[PDB]
Amino acid sequence: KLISTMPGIHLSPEQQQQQLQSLREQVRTKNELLQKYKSLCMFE
Amino acid sequence: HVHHLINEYRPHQARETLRVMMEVQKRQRLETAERFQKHLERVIEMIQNCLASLPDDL
């Protein structure tokens, strides 16, 4: 029981996985936005 | 009459000197503005290069 609780996830893993997927999507969106911003650099 | 002639002769030379000084001041201001514009353009280019380099390393 101690080894099982040692994992860290107190709440059920359903909402944990939902939040992890949301964070992964947000990270992908942020990376794509940063790439699109740093790519289109044609001003002077 | 001599004072009037002196005042008439010094006015043209004074106006020419004032115009030369104004032209020099305008040229200096134009040079300063061009240097500032070149510095701003170089800073923008460097900022863009740094932003492009940071996106590759991250």
Residue A37, judged by CB atoms within 10 A of its CB (0-12, 13-18, 19+), counts as exposed
- Confirm if B54 and A43 have CB atoms less than 8 A apart: no
> In this complex, is the C-beta atom of B21 within 8 Å of any C-beta atom belonging to chain A?
no
Angle at B57 between CA B53 and CA B58, to 5 degrees: 115
The whole-angstrom separation of Cα B46 and Cα B48 is: 5
- Confirm if B46 and A35 have CB atoms less than 8 A apart: no
The whole-angstrom separation of Cα B28 and Cα B50 is: 33
The whole-angstrom separation of Cα A16 and Cα A7 is: 13
The whole-angstrom separation of Cα A20 and Cα A18 is: 5
Structure tokens at B19: 């115009």
Q: Which residue of B has its CA nearest to A44?
A: B41
> In this complex, is the C-beta atom of B13 within 8 Å of any C-beta atom belonging to chain A?
no
Distance from B42 to chain A by nearest Cα, in Å?
A: 9
Handedness of CA B47, B51, B54, B56 (dihedral sign): negative
> Do A41 and B44 make contact, defined as CB atoms within 8 angstroms?
no
The whole-angstrom separation of Cα A13 and Cα A18 is: 8
B46: closest CA among B34, B38, B57?
A: B38
Give this entry's resolution in angstroms.
4.7
